[PDB]
Amino acid sequence: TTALVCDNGSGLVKAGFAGDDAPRAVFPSIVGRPRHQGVMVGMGQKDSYVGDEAQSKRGILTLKYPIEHGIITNWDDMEKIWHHTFYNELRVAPEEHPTLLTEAPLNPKANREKMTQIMFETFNVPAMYVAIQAVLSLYASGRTTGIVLDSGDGVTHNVPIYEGYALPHAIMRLDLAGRDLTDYLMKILTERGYSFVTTAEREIVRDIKEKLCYVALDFENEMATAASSSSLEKSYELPDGQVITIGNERFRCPETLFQPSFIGMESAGIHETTYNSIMKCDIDIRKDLYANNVMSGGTTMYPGIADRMQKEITALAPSTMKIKIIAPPERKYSVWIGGSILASLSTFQQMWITKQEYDEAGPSIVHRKC
Amino acid sequence: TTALVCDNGSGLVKAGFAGDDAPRAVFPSIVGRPRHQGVMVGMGQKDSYVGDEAQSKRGILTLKYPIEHGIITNWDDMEKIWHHTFYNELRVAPEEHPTLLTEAPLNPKANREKMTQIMFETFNVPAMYVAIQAVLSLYASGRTTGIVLDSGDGVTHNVPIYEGYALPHAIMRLDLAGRDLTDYLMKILTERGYSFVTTAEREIVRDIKEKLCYVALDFENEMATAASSSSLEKSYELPDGQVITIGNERFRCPETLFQPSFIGMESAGIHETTYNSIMKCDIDIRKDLYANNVMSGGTTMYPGIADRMQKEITALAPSTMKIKIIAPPERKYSVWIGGSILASLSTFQQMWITKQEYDEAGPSIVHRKC
Amino acid sequence: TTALVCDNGSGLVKAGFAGDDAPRAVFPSIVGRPRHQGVMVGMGQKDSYVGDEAQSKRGILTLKYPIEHGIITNWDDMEKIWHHTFYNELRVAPEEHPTLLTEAPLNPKANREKMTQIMFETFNVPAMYVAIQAVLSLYASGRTTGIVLDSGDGVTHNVPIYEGYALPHAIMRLDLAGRDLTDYLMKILTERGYSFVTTAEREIVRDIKEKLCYVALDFENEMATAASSSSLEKSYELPDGQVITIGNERFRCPETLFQPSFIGMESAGIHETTYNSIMKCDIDIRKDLYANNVMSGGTTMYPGIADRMQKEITALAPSTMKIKIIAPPERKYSVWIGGSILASLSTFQQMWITKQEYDEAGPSIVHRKC
Amino acid sequence: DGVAVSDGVIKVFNDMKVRKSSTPEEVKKRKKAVLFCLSEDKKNIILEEGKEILVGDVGQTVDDPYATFVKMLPDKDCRYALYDATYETKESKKEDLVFIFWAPESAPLKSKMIYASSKDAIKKKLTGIKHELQANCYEEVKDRCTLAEKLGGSAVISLEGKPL
Numbered sequence A, B, C: 001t002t003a004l005v006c007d008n009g010s011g012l013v014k015a016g017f018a019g020d021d022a023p024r025a026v027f028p029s030i031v032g033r034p035r036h037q038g039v040m041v042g043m044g045q046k047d048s049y050v051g052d053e054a055q056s057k058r059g060i061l062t063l064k065y066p067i068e069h070g071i072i073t074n075w076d077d078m079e080k081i082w083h084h085t086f087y088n089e090l091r092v093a094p095e096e097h098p099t100l101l102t103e104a105p106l107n108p109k110a111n112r113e114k115m116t117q118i119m120f121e122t123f124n125v126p127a128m129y130v131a132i133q134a135v136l137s138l139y140a141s142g143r144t145t146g147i148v149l150d151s152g153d154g155v156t157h158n159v160p161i162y163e164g165y166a167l168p169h170a171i172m173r174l175d176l177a178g179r180d181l182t183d184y185l186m187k188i189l190t191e192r193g194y195s196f197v198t199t200a201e202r203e204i205v206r207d208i209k210e211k212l213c214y215v216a217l218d219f220e221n222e223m224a225t226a227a228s229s230s231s232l233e234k235s236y237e238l239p240d241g242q243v244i245t246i247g248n249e250r251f252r253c254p255e256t257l258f259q260p261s262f263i264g265m266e267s268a269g270i271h272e273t274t275y276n277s278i279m280k281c282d283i284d285i286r287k288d289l290y291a292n293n294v295m296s297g298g299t300t301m302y303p304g305i306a307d308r309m310q311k312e313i314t315a316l317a318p319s320t321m322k323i324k325i326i327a328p329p330e331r332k333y334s335v336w337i338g339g340s341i342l343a344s345l346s347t348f349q350q351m352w353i354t355k356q357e358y359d360e361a362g363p364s365i366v367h368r369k370c
Numbered sequence D: 001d002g003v004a005v006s007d008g009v010i011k012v013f014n015d016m017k018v019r020k021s022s023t024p025e026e027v028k029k030r031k032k033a034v035l036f037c038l039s040e041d042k043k044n045i046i047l048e049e050g051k052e053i054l055v056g057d058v059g060q061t062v063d064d065p066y067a068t069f070v071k072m073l074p075d076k077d078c079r080y081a082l083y084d085a086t087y088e089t090k091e092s093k094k095e096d097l098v099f100i101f102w103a104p105e106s107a108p109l110k111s112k113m114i115y116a117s118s119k120d121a122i123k124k125k126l127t128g129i130k131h132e133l134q135a136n137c138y139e140e141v142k143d144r145c146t147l148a149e150k151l152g153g154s155a156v157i158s159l160e161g162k163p164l
Ligand SMILES: Nc1ncnc2c1ncn2[C@@H]1O[C@H](COP(=O)(O)OP(=O)(O)O)[C@@H](O)[C@H]1O
Pocket: A007, A008, A009, A010, A011, A012, A013, A151, A152, A153, A154, A178, A179, A206, A209, A210, A211, A297, A298, A299, A300, A301, A302, A332, A335
């Protein structure tokens, strides 16, 4: 009866039933093969470790993400993570409840085809559907009008949606996301005397960026304050026991979202892609899209990103237009919230692709249906 | 004595003397600022790169087009490109030979005013003239009757011309051209696993569209053949060494010329705008305009575009009328051919706007003269 | 008038004037405190020994490297080595000729700040500059395009450089270098019955690796030849008089450069980091970076490392692309060659940071200038 | 670097790159291909009046502008060059200038290092030049196909008024 919604993101896998507020299953999407020979005999040494067990034993593992910027690079570990979150995390079978998968727009069709094939052949689900992460994150907002700024761990994409009709010709996609921010933070933290080279360590930098990084109102004056005094510096407690003192890196690595020239990308920052997509949209819907900029994803959780997004957009947009940046306090899981509120809808229950519909169509039904 | 004809197009700049068959100077109209700091000292690093030197060093540059859909967005780089094609490409001075500039109809007067001001103040030409690209492309055809389908890199416009008297009230303008086709190809190539985000890369997609794209006789049956088998797929040699396998994208992105709903435009395709303009023309000249559809520009170089244009027009036009689509083998430079054959005419030599005529008139003589 | 170039490397200090081919001063960068009480009275017993005098008296000393993987761990002995190479080796004063220092990319700013402070306060140089070792090693090649594989005694780093504009976002750094190879050789030589525990002895293993180690074309077949017969074994003359018989250790310890899992590092070998950095670079410069892999440093002096680097890169790179590995016969001092050819350049003579420029700026001018 | 350029070479380059309306009698003494050298002191880039090629003579005394130009380069010394090519492409007919960096292996190192380290001092002053041709061996510069390969690649069908 109930439906499963599985937000297979690049950094986290939010999986839970339909009709509830919060996702019960949340864990990093990485698999870890044992790095060392393992002299001790017995104790249950396994070939792989998924999620929290990998996070706890990350010292002797070699963590890696199966999903790049949205595309699934490796498939065996992806279906392994799916089997894990289905059996060892939710303790349910896929043959009973329909599953709901999410993806980013401007996605290779091979990824969706392999998703459908894996879901229908290995697990044999009665029905499923492949929605868009940004559209669901807009559902969670309760409204139907406004452009969505969805930026997760691997991809940042924006799609403007009017009063039910979205604009596919203005869908912008930026490969700059949280993983690139973590890489830039690792690259700029070596200038302080802290080398993070290995994948296992990189997670420490990820947590440091998650709980110590913020976006400045403006770059120049915050640098001037960084240059003068240590009033800005703050210390962190490392798992090994040492302490580090980061200064301008607290707001320099989040600035890459607005100035991609730091990691080398030529793409316009997240504050300019939205304005360029709205300027590519229709001239009557711009008044409604300017005052509705729905943000989602874990990357939009920095303290002060909403204020800078606002300021930049009213700097780009005309003065008479008013800019509003909807910053929900549960925007980290807004995609899952939208999927769960979508799965309970009665009108949507008819457009699930079913096995009986899938047999004659093959793995190509997903493009024509979704 | 000789006159210069400079077709300052949106994608290419065809510049050459008068009285010759082919333009000697052909290069993309882009300027590139250095993207990276440039650690190496010396070797002649420059602030900008224009044309072929930018195409060769496009890896470390950030290419951009000064001309949008026909309007000149930035003026400093435009006059820089003019100075380049005058001095570093033709090795001639503008003070001696008169220059001939081209433009698309339904053009903002500010663009032509700035053109005249730059040509008369910075270079101080003895005389000049601002013609229309489609009228010159019709001159190159040797005839005087027939509607012109001029579609370059930024704008597609159609103007029906009778036995010397053109019809300005039926001049249609469509903002759909080769740049929009390249953008659509970039957007639809990400579904195969090839991401082209940066401007430098986009040129690779441009060459792929130039030498691998064709227009189908009809969309439906070609899709049916695309759906079934790989008999249609063809591989391409990328500069980096990799190979790509494009399928329906060979004829899907050129279909935007006839179905603008792909990139989101609401404008009727190039096959319907011509018919609507002819139906807006006089009822006695329609018999002569139906059998004379002169095509020009680089966008009309797809294999099979002439046959589809024909079929569509005889589908729209009455049955008793016969439709002819003049597809010249040098229609890529037909505007320059017409300009060069026009500059040698003796009757035209009297209507050049001269500096002595320009002094008292200011930059507003061009509207009343041309 | 002349300028001093001082390549303060992790294992050797190449110091010499500008405008000459070879560095006149070459010696190991270690300081040695007297280990034993020293019963004999007189004879000039000193508190420390630097360079060749330490190498000759290494029996009773405790050698140690002030520079780790590129960062300077201890500062008193570093400035002592600088004073030594300035006075007791070159017999010149720093107050007259400007000095040129080198460093590896992705270096802590504290190291460069302390370098500048020591050079400007203790020696009071008229001017100086802090360049990059890989950029200078590329200068020595005479060309401007190509990625540099710089691997010394403490750090291995790669930076791709195009026709004057380098790419800082693709700068890879690997902490695997000659010191790690020496440690691995010491660890794997105990399996033959030769224990090297002390620092003084470790230099014998260093010379053994320098004049008896080579890199195999492939690991598997060379192991098969090592397993069968002693056709591979070769003897060495120890300073104490004994002889040793090393077998597979001749090509096992240099394999760590390509398989870091031997010493435990998780980093991709030197053959994969270059390919990953080029794949992180721009798509138009990859054709020029694939055919230009400039190697430098003393670690790249193994017999057969160029052939294996080639084979591995054409195994990773596409087939249509051609791979070239520039293996110069003076790549051991290529950084010093580039520094010396750089110091004679007239255009570079303007960008030296001077004392008058340094006074108001403090020790922070180096980041904004270099 | 070191060696800089004189005023005569800059004047010659500005004269060759930018042509103006000229009389039919004077137009025949324009400079077609001029080389560059060093003085006794090796401090300035000077053109030698001895070895040169006029535009007037091309097609008359000089049957082949390129063919008579290869032998004009000395094989025992390093030289610069500036060749005005008139090649025909499939696409169109172009007329560009080529910078040829002649540097044989038989020349002494004193003449090779000076001309290689000061190449940025001359190439930067020659504004607007695009086609760069670095030639070290004599056989590679003697061949006719290499000029069409550097200029336009496989697109150049004819070079200097004659097909390939
Ligand atoms: N409190 C926080 N502050 C800043 N960044 C955060 C915070 N929490 C998570 N992130 C970043 O957000 C990313 C998670 O993205 P997520 O929303 O899970 O993407 P997806 O929905 O595609 O899985 C992490 O990589 C992390 O770097």
